[PDB]
Design a protein around this ligand. Structure first.
Ligand code: W5W
Length: 274
């Protein structure tokens, strides 16, 4: 093959990922080797936006599926773990969040959903830019970033499932701690309820008719938000609480969130990566 596999960079759910070199172009790429979908996947090649990792080639040869992506060196999770002692500067936080929303706003306007948006698959660079990886393919794994409508067994997700995840990552960058670090579907769901209170028909019309909603859930009270994400300012908390509305239809759109006053003073600073 016209691909020379430098080294393995991770295992996925259907295939493995390699850093590779395209023998034609001398082009360094992320290469996913997996063992109707091919047609549905191929469409993501058309998505071109500065905050989407580019899907370069979908190869279906030797009855096998290779996906080739734009390569980047570091993911947000490594950059969070590295920036643990000092914490990410708020201007860099604000930049990444504004950028990720422009990506979601782009994906959503083309009817494209991530579903499993988490820090591991947010890639960064020396220009101080952040890109969405593994976007629109999905169509033990951590549940830390799973929307409450998924955990309650809704089959028919909307774009609001990704706004939730971004809100969780925003909190994590600010606090240096997963917001809802759950270790089972019930544990995850109960961690959200311990912070935002158990939902009801008042705040979430339909919630009692969800597939996996029990009337036998405990009734927890909502926690004040200055205790959850300090010392984030009132704009940040305001934007976070609109991103974490229980009711997906009340949950703020990526487009609407770009016009939030939190981004009035937004800049593009440049990180120190190793
Ligand atoms: C550091 O990046 C990793 C290895 C990341 O630790 C990780 O968790 C997985 C599973 C990856 O998977 C990827 O598929 C991936 C894609 C689509 C593009 C890309 O440029 C890169 C570099 C990719 O590697 C990432």
């Amino acid at each position: 093959e016209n691909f020379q596999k430098v080294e393995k960079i991770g295992e996925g759910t259907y295939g493995v990922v390699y850093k590779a070199r395209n023998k034609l172009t001398g082009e360094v790429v992320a290469l996913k080797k997996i063992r109707t979908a091919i047609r549905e996947i191929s469409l993501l090649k058309e998505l071109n936006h500065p905050n989407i990792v580019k899907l370069l080639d979908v190869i279906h040869t030797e009855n096998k599926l290779y996906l080739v992506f734009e390569f980047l060196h570091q993911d947000l999770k490594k950059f969070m773990d590295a920036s643990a002692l000092t914490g990410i500067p708020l201007p860099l936080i604000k930049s990444y969040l504004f950028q990720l929303l422009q990506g979601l706003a782009f994906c959503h306007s083309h009817r494209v959903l991530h579903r499993d948006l988490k820090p591991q698959n947010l890639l960064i660079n020396t220009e101080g830019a952040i890109k969405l990886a593994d976007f629109g393919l999905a169509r033990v794994v951590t549940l830390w970033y799973r929307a409450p409508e998924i955990l309650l067994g809704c089959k028919y997700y909307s774009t609001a499932v990704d706004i939730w995840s971004l809100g969780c990552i925003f909190a994590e960058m600010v606090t240096r701690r997963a917001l809802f670090p759950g270790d089972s579907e019930i544990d995850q769901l109960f961690r959200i309820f311990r912070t935002l209170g158990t939902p009801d028909e008042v705040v979430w019309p339909g919630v009692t008719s969800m597939p996996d909603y029990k009337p036998s859930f405990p009734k927890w009270a909502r926690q004040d938000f200055s205790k959850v994400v300090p010392p984030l300012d009132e704009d940040g908390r305001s934007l976070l609480s609109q991103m974490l509305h229980y009711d997906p239809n009340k949950r703020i759109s990526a487009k609407a969130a770009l016009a939030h006053p939190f981004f009035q003073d937004v800049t593009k600073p440049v990180p120190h990566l190793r």
